Amino acid sequence: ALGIPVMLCSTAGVRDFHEWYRDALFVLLRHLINNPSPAHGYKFFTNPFWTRPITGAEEGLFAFITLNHLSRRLGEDPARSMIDEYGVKHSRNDLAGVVEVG
Amino acid sequence: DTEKRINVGKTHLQTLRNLETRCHDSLQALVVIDAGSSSTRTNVFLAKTRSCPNKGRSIDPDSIQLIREGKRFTGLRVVLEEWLDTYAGKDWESRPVDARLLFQYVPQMHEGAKKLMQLLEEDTVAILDSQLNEEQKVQVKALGIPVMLCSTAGVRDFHEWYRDALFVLLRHLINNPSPAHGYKFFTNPFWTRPITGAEEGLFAFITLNHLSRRLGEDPARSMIDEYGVKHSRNDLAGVVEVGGASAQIVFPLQEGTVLPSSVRAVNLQRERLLPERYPSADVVSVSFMQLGMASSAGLFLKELCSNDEFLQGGICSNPCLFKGFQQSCSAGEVEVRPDGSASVNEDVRKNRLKPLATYCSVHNPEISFKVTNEMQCRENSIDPTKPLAERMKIENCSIIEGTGNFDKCVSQVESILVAPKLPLPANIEAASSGFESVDQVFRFASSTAPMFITGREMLASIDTLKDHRLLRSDFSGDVEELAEAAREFCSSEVIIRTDGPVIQLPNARGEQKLNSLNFDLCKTMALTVSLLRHMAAGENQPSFIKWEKSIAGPDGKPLADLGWQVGVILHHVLFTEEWGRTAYEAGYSHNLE
Amino acid sequence: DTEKRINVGKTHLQTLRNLETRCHDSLQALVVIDAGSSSTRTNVFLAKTRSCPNKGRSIDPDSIQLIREGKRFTGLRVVLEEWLDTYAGKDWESRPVDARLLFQYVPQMHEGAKKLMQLLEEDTVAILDSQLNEEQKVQVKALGIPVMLCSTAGVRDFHEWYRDALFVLLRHLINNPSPAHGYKFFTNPFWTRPITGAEEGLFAFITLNHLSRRLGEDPARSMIDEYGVKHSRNDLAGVVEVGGASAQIVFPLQEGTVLPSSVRAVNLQRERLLPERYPSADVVSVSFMQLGMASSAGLFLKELCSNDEFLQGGICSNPCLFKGFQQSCSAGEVEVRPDGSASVNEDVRKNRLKPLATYCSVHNPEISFKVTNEMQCRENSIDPTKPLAERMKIENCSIIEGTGNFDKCVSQVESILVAPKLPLPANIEAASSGFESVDQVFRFASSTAPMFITGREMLASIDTLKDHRLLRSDFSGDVEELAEAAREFCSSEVIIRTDGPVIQLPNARGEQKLNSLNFDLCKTMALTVSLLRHMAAGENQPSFIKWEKSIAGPDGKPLADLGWQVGVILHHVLFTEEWGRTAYEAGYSHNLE
Numbered sequence A: 001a002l003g004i005p006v007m008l009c010s011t012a013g014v015r016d017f018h019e020w021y022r023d024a025l026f027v028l029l030r031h032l033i034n035n036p037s038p039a040h041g042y043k044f045f046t047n048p049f050w051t052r053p054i055t056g057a058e059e060g061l062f063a064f065i066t067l068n069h070l071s072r073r074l075g076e077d078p079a080r081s082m083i084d085e086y087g088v089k090h091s092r093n094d095l096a097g098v099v100e101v102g
Numbered sequence B, C: 001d002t003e004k005r006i007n008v009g010k011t012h013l014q015t016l017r018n019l020e021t022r023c024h025d026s027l028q029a030l031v032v033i034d035a036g037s038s039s040t041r042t043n044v045f046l047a048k049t050r051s052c053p054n055k056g057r058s059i060d061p062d063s064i065q066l067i068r069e070g071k072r073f074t075g076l077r078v079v080l081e082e083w084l085d086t087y088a089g090k091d092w093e094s095r096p097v098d099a100r101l102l103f104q105y106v107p108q109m110h111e112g113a114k115k116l117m118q119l120l121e122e123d124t125v126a127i128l129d130s131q132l133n134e135e136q137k138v139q140v141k142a143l144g145i146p147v148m149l150c151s152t153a154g155v156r157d158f159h160e161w162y163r164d165a166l167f168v169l170l171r172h173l174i175n176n177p178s179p180a181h182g183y184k185f186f187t188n189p190f191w192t193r194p195i196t197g198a199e200e201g202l203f204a205f206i207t208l209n210h211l212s213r214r215l216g217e218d219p220a221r222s223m224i225d226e227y228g229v230k231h232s233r234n235d236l237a238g239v240v241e242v243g244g245a246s247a248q249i250v251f252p253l254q255e256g257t258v259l260p261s262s263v264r265a266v267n268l269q270r271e272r273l274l275p276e277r278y279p280s281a282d283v284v285s286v287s288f289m290q291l292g293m294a295s296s297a298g299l300f301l302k303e304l305c306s307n308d309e310f311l312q313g314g315i316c317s318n319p320c321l322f323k324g325f326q327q328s329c330s331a332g333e334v335e336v337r338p339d340g341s342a343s344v345n346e347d348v349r350k351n352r353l354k355p356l357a358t359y360c361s362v363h364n365p366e367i368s369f370k371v372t373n374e375m376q377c378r379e380n381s382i383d384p385t386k387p388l389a390e391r392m393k394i395e396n397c398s399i400i401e402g403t404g405n406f407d408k409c410v411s412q413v414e415s416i417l418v419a420p421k422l423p424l425p426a427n428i429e430a431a432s433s434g435f436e437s438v439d440q441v442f443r444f445a446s447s448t449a450p451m452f453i454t455g456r457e458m459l460a461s462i463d464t465l466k467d468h469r470l471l472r473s474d475f476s477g478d479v480e481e482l483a484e485a486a487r488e489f490c491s492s493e494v495i496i497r498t499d500g501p502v503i504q505l506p507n508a509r510g511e512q513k514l515n516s517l518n519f520d521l522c523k524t525m526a527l528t529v530s531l532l533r534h535m536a537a538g539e540n541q542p543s544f545i546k547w548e549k550s551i552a553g554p555d556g557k558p559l560a561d562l563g564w565q566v567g568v569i570l571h572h573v574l575f576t577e578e579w580g581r582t583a584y585e586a587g588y589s590h591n592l593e
């Protein structure tokens, strides 16, 4: 009933890919997601903001967000964050960094 | 050695980097002008503003504190009545007046309002100059001063277009202050406007719950259940406010208290009184005209001394007045002189029956076209056909004598003020919410929420009995405990001594000096008994009934006084985006040429 | 008779009712400080603010007009270099310097920046006082003055932390102005910050299209198709800006022009440059270091006089210099004296090869750790191992002689500046967008959008030929029409006459006085030919190429000058909610204690 947001992100595989080809493939990939089999009932959909080639910095930044979210270091609630006397929100625990070797 | 030397410069950049990233607090002044029945007075407040990068500027609701309530200047009713006396002719109350013709005298109304506004402006500046330091003055002058002038029961019953036309002129006078003082006062039709009786009551409820720390959106005062609904940690308290011309009865509805279709309750979030982030509540808010101290005093004397049971050979026997007390038969201001005598001011302006007699006129369209309002006046002894002087006059009466019977006083306050046959004049707003009278409030709507009583005389009724040891230091609000204490006090004799008139309590209990404030306090004592009787009669009874003047803050010192003032501020300031647009984005700079 | 009398008072209320309901316009000053390579100058703008009830305060983008561009004070590079000369020792360019140790000299950097900021503040106030009237001064002082100081190519290549630390100090100096003048200047890290080469170009594009009425969100400049997409009515024009140290090439991509994966185009809405309500466009924005007038002049002399084809027995033959012209062999500032001689200033600060030689140092981490940047310096004849003086020195050269061959000058500007083997030093930003050089821009990305050329000398190259009747009054921008006109002009002899040095045109065409501005204009003429050659080589060719100084407004008078200034204002002001929060809600009041 709610629909299934689909996020297809390409990494180092096509990051160095020459000419237009990769970007043209992504326009075709989104149309294929937006047009799924009606038989299964699962309403898959996408947009150029969700399905797109992600940069190396973005790939790393999202990996940082995953680590800190799961380990409960990142949060906007009083359990994981704190507001000082100058109205600035700081995290209660130190944010951890990541080294991912794909 | 040099490690500590390079750290000073590193700290120098960090301090500067913190200044730009952090929020900055600045002091701002807020003005609420209570344009009530009795008088028009300024209320100067101070609040802490917080400006954050990409977050704009907002007011800390908990930082809102009253610095001073200014001098009591001429009421809006007097200003408009003086204008009609000179531009529509003297004794316009007894003659048919053409409202269309008064439009040529609008610049003349501006001068009348200018005189009052210049006094209020001068007083506000005098308060700010005396309380603020030079550093505080700079922050206050730079941010601008939002002004909120709201009219209550004084001009609520005012006939024709005059009241609304005055408000357009009042806003222009605020928006154009003296540049000499430096204080940048500004207003808009959303801040400066006549407030309804329900609104007056609702703001008084918001003030009480804010100051007592019952209403809040933070985890300290509120709680989110497993279904994402914010509830307040402490029970929201209701209020009973008794002014000069009107009384407000406000209380929130606890649980799923099902009400009749005719009875109209107000949800604070749905009716845009409080933001969505605040905990929701369905509140019953009703205001009754002719119930305030000054107006109820005049109406009681008119109805009691018109009844054959109390008027005999020109001598009206009043059960709400002490034994031995004597006064002239008129609703005019009573001054208790040092020789025991009661001086009654016979001036039309100083007469307490004037606002009611001015409303009850066959020349007022609310009477001539509406028969229902005419019968409401006639039942309260006012003949709308008769001239103004004849309306305020207590016919076939010369002297009012005090009988001192408390039980007879309660019985009369009940039939006249609390539960009359027809509703008291100028109460269409109350009737539209489903309440024709005070008795109907607790009959149709009841709550288990604690009640708070406000009003100079309402407190005085309790304190006087507490002082003479007739009531316990700890008083929960027992109806018959109060009625027994007041019955012994009201039966007291008045002895004219060398020092002056003294209230001699029976069975040698004690004594106190008789003055212009306590001579008729037994009428208010009876009003409190009757009010608590209906609260105890209702399906749901309050947890406790408290009598308070002002709420003590966290430091021990009171933050602000009880009333609609703080409530009207919070009604605007709590809407973060809307407040920032009107107070900071538009600001006093909007008034510039 | 009385019908007209009552109507005056009726109008009196309507006028007052209109004032509160209507919007009010107030004048506000905006300051953009161009902290460029050559100098640091203020740009005072004036805009019309509009405050509406419940709608807040906003700026009319079309009302934005430049009143004056202030005096040209010391550049940020000079301020930081003077600080290093006194706190890291003299000739720090040839010695290894410990950056950590410089942290103890941060308060000393504040004093150096204070001296420059006080000059800029004094100049800004002098402009405002001279142009604004008393009524205008009040509105300007009350609203506050947003200040936007942005650094460009001058400190873009600046080594270590120094540049960013200076910006933290610069913001504190703006936020703390002299209270005596009354003008309330304020800033934030979003307004005052070093801008990138792409941003510098993108803002210059926004300025051009705004002033020429090509970019707008209204129906006059835009159109909504049947699929709810806003398109601009007129084609968006591109810009070519040539400054002191860098050149920007900006153009929007028309239609579905497919680009390679390496080439990075910027969508104005997606990258938050313009609001969603504005028509969308994919724009190619690239900036090239060592391409600006001053930096390209120094680099050309270094590379040309290092080639064996041009240097013989200490005499460097320059094809971009006129026949008979003679000067010393150094990149220092050339002053054409009245006796025909060329005075070359040998001061390190005044030398045009200094910013390049300071960047190309083995002590700079961008060279010592990055071999690629070292080879970029070595190919442009700068040895990073050698001392500062030896780097700027044109080895085995004494005198530069002018040959006046235009075709040879074009061929050299092409191989050195336009299309070199390796990219010109400090161009990592350009390379990351997919453009190592100027020739690669139109090779990988091309547009049918009209181009606009900006820069003192770029215009002078066209105007000089137009004045001597070598080019038509109406000049579309033909490449070979320009090359023929410039070839005849550059071959001109220099005759030292009693009046001074005169440029004698061949076949008795005409004559003009030779000065410090036009002596090397043939290098810029060749640059324009090479630039137009690549534009004509690209898959898509511009509709027309125009040379403009400033854009004429609707009244005929120009609103503002072309550059990144108006663009940076519109980048902030057009985000209605965000601008109102920072400029009006927070304002100068944020700086208060």
Ligand SMILES: Nc1ncnc2c1ncn2[C@@H]1O[C@H](COP(=O)(O)OP(=O)(O)NP(=O)(O)O)[C@@H](O)[C@H]1O
Residues within 6 Å of the ligand: B034, B035, B036, B037, B038, B039, B072, B152, B153, B154, B242, B243, B244, B245, B246, B247, B292, B293, B294, B456, B457
């Ligand atoms: N200085 C005073 N402070 C407090 N109460 C006063 C004062 N002077 C008189 N009173 C008493 O309090 C009543 C007026 O109370 P007040 O709080 O001013 O309401 P109001 O604004 O005049 N009435 P309303 O129009 O219904 O809001 C008078 O009728 C007096 O009994």
Ligand SMILES: Nc1ncnc2c1ncn2[C@@H]1O[C@H](COP(=O)(O)OP(=O)(O)NP(=O)(O)O)[C@@H](O)[C@H]1O
Residues within 6 Å of the ligand: C034, C035, C036, C037, C038, C039, C072, C152, C153, C154, C242, C243, C244, C245, C246, C247, C292, C293, C294, C456, C457
């Ligand atoms: N007063 C002046 N007005 C305009 N151009 C000037 C002026 N003085 C010198 N110029 C010339 O224009 C160049 C500087 O142009 P300018 O617009 O100030 O860019 P810039 O800000 O110094 N460079 P950049 O850091 O890349 O933004 C100099 O190299 C001169 O050739």
Ligand SMILES: [Mg+2]
Residues within 6 Å of the ligand: A011, A102
């Ligand atoms: Mg991976």
Ligand SMILES: [Mg+2]
Residues within 6 Å of the ligand: B034, B036, B037, B152, B243
């Ligand atoms: Mg009141």
Ligand SMILES: [Mg+2]
Residues within 6 Å of the ligand: C034, C036, C037, C152, C243
């Ligand atoms: Mg520039």
